[PDB]
Design a protein around this ligand. Structure first.
Ligand SMILES: Nc1nc2c(c(=O)[nH]1)N=C(CNc1ccc(S(=O)(=O)Nc3nccs3)cc1)CN2
Ligand SMILES: Nc1nc2c(c(=O)[nH]1)N=C(CNc1ccc(S(=O)(=O)Nc3nccs3)cc1)CN2
Ligand SMILES: Nc1ncnc2c1ncn2[C@@H]1O[C@H](COP(=O)(O)O)[C@@H](O)[C@H]1O
Ligand SMILES: Nc1ncnc2c1ncn2[C@@H]1O[C@H](COP(=O)(O)O)[C@@H](O)[C@H]1O
Ligand SMILES: Nc1nc2c(c(=O)[nH]1)N=C(CO)CN2
Ligand SMILES: [Ca+2]
Ligand SMILES: [Ca+2]
Ligand SMILES: [Mg+2]
Ligand SMILES: [Mg+2]
Lengths: 558, 534
């Protein structure tokens, strides 16, 4: 073993890798980055963190996808979708603690900086001769070393044929290898260790020329805003030995320096993205209406419900939230009929009736299902009936449902809502030490749990659960302080809740029904100025009319 | 003797300050004072806003009438006033007149020794000299609690250090201007013009900046505006305080204080064109119960007088079937002098809503003043009539043309002794405005931040322009889109909004008011720090 002593070593280890994923195809960004995300889970190890998606300014200065997915070679390492609460190796990575010794030879901090600076200054005047879509992931990887991992990454880039995947960190290592040449047989041997290889011929041809040197950290880690922007979401307290500071301090200095040194305000043109289904949404650029479809006095027939769905589409709802449970305080569900029996038939009919399309392939509303029950969501998702899980337990009731959010090539988005107890008990469970931050921190802990378990950060929506184990003054208090969610994708449901009525001064009890809907439009307005991303409403047309007037008043004509 | 008694009746420009300490009756105390000024001194040709600052039913039928005669006729120019402002030649000072340093040294002598509801006025006065006026002013003070002071009198730099005037001399000045004294002697120690604290009390500079920003007395170092601006500059830099917070600008809809920009009042629309006056008066009570602060009645073959006076009279009677007083302010949507005169003589209305901005018949302004009473007015911008206005939409500068129009218009009413704090501005949405221009007026509503603003979007056609069986659908969207403008108006602090759908508007404003009522306005950063520390 001249080259293969330790590189091909049978002794299996667990490393932490931090990757950067980039594309400049805006229209296909989500499909390309998430196809890269699936090849990372498949070939490199386990995804235990992701940044938001960003639309980023170029910083040079400083459906064959669908075909491919049916024809992939099998990893020699097993998938494990089982939930985890902890990852020790990742704990160790973050404290810069004692991971295993590098099989690739390390440089010291001063040599690293010398060689890093040389690549950039040489890369600057080479460059002196569209938007980016960026994402970072932390991977718990079975790959033995960064060079091994770069070889597998370049294979992933080749399968995909558009995509840049870089290694930013690998363990606490500092590495600068200058004139790497791996023979084609050596590349095959490294791929074979991680993959059951079966047109992977000309691919090995390509890769020999392409792996020229190996920098860990990445040279541009510290020099691109787009990279620090992403790392700041995942690992802000991280300090590599080669960095003047923690990633958050590096991120903050960069933002500041652009203000004071150039008067730029760099956030304006590097935009945070959340994904509801398969398309980019710019965080805080739009208040989408989520139309409520309660399939539950009882016996809501599927035909009636589906025509309500079509009504709500025409009234301007961009999302439909269907549910067969009832969450009102002090009530129990319908006599016999099961949750699945209420929602699946409705959804199956809707899906058929929409398929009688004419030809608007992007006037289709996103479907959200309000369920905490695995069996219902499992059936909805297998039968392509829903896009979004609306879990009012924040996946707490049965965290197994988190496994259903990851299909082989698909990812589903999810709303995490705060409540305490159940409908009968929740009006009792009203004591908070720090209401606003208690609830915010709960949702942040839930998101960390999903993200640790491989759910993309940008597919996760926060919801404060207004009226769920909150007094009316507490529901109000969370709306007063909603700015607390300014960095995050936000979903709220005020519609027709008792607290609205508590705000009002003082036909037969239907005068209170009217003031309640009219009071909700006040909140729709408030939400609009607070740039709330989604509002769950019963009254789609009334809310739509309000958001259109407010939108028009904001648009300056020329 | 002295020239003081000179029988001749030539005209001087006098700037007064008016103060009271009563909160509720401040209007009645200050407006009663404006009338007595008007009656015994000459003509009110300017007033400021009423400001709250951080430092009689019987009397009006038992009036000693004046030796002069009040000309109610409208004016558009005042030569004496225009000369006063440039400090041009005026009939020379009949009193002993000191110079700059002798005034400052003596001024300083009063400040260093003796170490709230404000309203300035300007008066074209027949009175010969400030001393004579201060006898009338003080005599007036004694009939009414109230401190009336002379800020200026022509360009005069008067200082008179000791003053004793025997009862016989006071009777002869009061008799000169009045068909008829104890304390004037005990109370009139000296005379300073300009008044000593002119350039010191913020409450005084604040009021003068409303009336005469570009006035420059040679005693003062700068124009009233630059002295005013520099002070606001100092209070922020040195003490790090916004002076506005506690010194609040006031407007008046009837007889009570309204803090400018602190509430969005609902004005409920009663169009008695769509009758049974019993139905319409039912609708007025309905609207009061749905939350209308104000009712705006209008009629426009049977006359508008026969459509609206019966209704207002039935109403005012049905309100007598109440044997406390959360009573609605009444607005009449008329440009007809005669219709407003009837209503005002029968005490059926508090406000003139004139959509011609008092341009159909400027004489209507004469009805906003009485012997004692004052009525407030809404001045709306439009062009043409309902048949022609949709084509009258070309403007040099849409936003500023309409502002300057309403500002020229307020200058006219104020020149004619209408109190500035009773004049509400309305941009007239949808009147000689394209839908995009109605929007642009709303987008630029901040341009009325200093002024009482009254707007009417309700059910207008531009709302529909904002939006993407079928007829009843457009009508519902129109009411719903209006609730967005109520929301916008609430956040832009629009003082009044004229709406058809009171209940819906009231629902919205209650919810928005609640979201804004923060128990502890430090809690957001406190609570955040707590969480960072836990
Ligand atoms: N993401 C998300 N999903 C939802 C939500 C929601 O807010 N967010 N709300 C309901 C409806 N549940 C509910 C309805 C009314 C009240 S309440 O406010 O009207 N009743 C009471 N609140 C406090 C004391 S009694 C509470 C919960 C169903 N699904
Ligand atoms: N202070 C005050 N008083 C008013 C106001 C107002 O805005 N302010 N508006 C009307 C109602 N005027 C009106 C109604 C509808 C339209 S429109 O937008 O629907 N367009 C029309 N174009 C031609 C005839 S009606 C325009 C004006 C009556 N009185
Ligand atoms: N940490 C790293 N991640 C990815 N490529 C790296 C790294 N360090 C050096 N490289 C080299 O950078 C080149 C890839 O550039 P690019 O084509 O822009 O992705 C190849 O020669 C890689 O060997
Ligand atoms: N410009 C002035 N206006 C009114 N009173 C003045 C003026 N200059 C001096 N005084 C005298 O100062 C007193 C002010 O009393 P006070 O109301 O406490 O400010 C009056 O009684 C007058 O005799
Ligand atoms: N914002 C941004 N700039 C770049 C990126 C990138 O991914 N994002 N990648 C580059 C080389 O592929 C060059 N510059
Ligand atoms: Ca995996
Ligand atoms: Ca007079
Ligand atoms: Mg690269
Ligand atoms: Mg005084």
């Amino acid at each position: 073993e001249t080259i293969q002593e330790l590189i091909l070593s049978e002794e299996n280890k667990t490393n932490i890798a931090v990757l950067n994923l980039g594309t400049n195809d805006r229209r296909n960004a989500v499909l390309i980055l998430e196809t890269a995300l699936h090849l990372v889970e498949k070939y490199l190890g386990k995804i235990i963190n992701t940044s938001y998606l960003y639309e980023t300014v170029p910083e040079y200065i400083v459906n064959y996808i669908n075909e491919l997915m049916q024809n992939l070679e099998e990893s020699k390492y097993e998938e494990n979708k089982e939930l985890i609460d902890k990852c020790e190796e990742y704990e160790t990575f973050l404290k810069n603690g004692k991971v295993d010794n590098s099989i690739l030879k390390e440089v010291n901090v001063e040599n690293y900086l010398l060689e890093c600076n040389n690549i950039i200054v040489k890369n600057d005047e080479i460059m002196k001769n569209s938007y980016f879509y960026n994402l970072t992931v932390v991977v718990k990887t079975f790959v033995n070393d960064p060079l091994s991992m770069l070889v597998v990454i370049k294979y992933i880039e080749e399968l995909m044929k558009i995509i840049d995947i870089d290694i930013l960190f690998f363990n606490d290592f500092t590495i600068f290898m200058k004139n790497i040449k791996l023979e084609k047989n050596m590349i095959y041997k490294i791929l074979s260790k991680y993959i059951h290889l079966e047109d992977p011929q000309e691919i090995i041809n390509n890769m020999v020329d392409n792996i020229e040197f190996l920098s860990i950290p990445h040279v541009y880690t510290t020099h691109r805003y787009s990279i620090l922007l992403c790392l700041n979401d995942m690992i802000p307290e991280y300090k590599h030995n080669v960095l003047n500071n923690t990633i958050r301090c590096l991120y903050n200095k960069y933002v500041s320096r652009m203000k004071e040194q150039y008067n730029i305000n760099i956030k304006e043109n590097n935009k945070r993205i959340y994904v509801l289904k398969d398309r980019i949404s710019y965080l805080k650029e739009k208040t989408n209406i989520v139309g409520i479809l309660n399939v539950n006095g009882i016996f809501v027939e599927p035909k009636r419900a589906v025509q309500r769905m079509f009504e709500m589409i025409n009234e301007g709802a961009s999302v439909i939230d269907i549910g067969g449970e009832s969450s009102a305080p002090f009530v129990i569900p319908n006599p016999k009929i099961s949750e699945r029996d209420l929602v699946v038939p409705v959804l199956q009919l809707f899906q058929k009736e929409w398929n009688d399309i004419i030809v608007k392939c992007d006037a289709k509303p996103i479907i959200s299902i309000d369920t905490i029950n695995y069996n219902v969501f499992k059936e909805c998702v297998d039968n392509d009936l829903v896009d979004i899980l609306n879990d009012i337990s924040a996946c707490t009731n049965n965290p197994e449902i988190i496994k259903l959010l990851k299909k082989k090539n698909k990812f589903y988005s999810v709303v995490l809502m705060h409540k305490r107890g159940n409908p009968h008990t929740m009006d009792k469970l009203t004591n908070y030490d720090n209401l606003v931050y208690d609830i915010k921190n709960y949702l942040e802990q839930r998101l960390n749990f999903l993200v640790l378990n491989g759910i993309p950060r940008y597919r996760i929506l926060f919801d404060i659960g207004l009226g769920f184990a909150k007094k009316h003054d507490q529901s109000i208090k969370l709306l007063q302080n909603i700015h607390v969610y300014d960095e995050y994708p936000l979903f709220i449901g005020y519609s027709r809740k008792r607290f609205i009525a508590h705000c009002m001064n003082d036909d037969k009890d239907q005068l209170l029904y009217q003031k309640n809907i009219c009071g909700g439009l006040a909140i729709a307005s408030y939400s609009y100025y607070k740039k709330v991303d989604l509002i769950r409403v019963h009254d789609v047309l009334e809310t739509k009319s309000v958001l259109d007037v407010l939108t028009k008043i904001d648009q300056v004509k020329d």
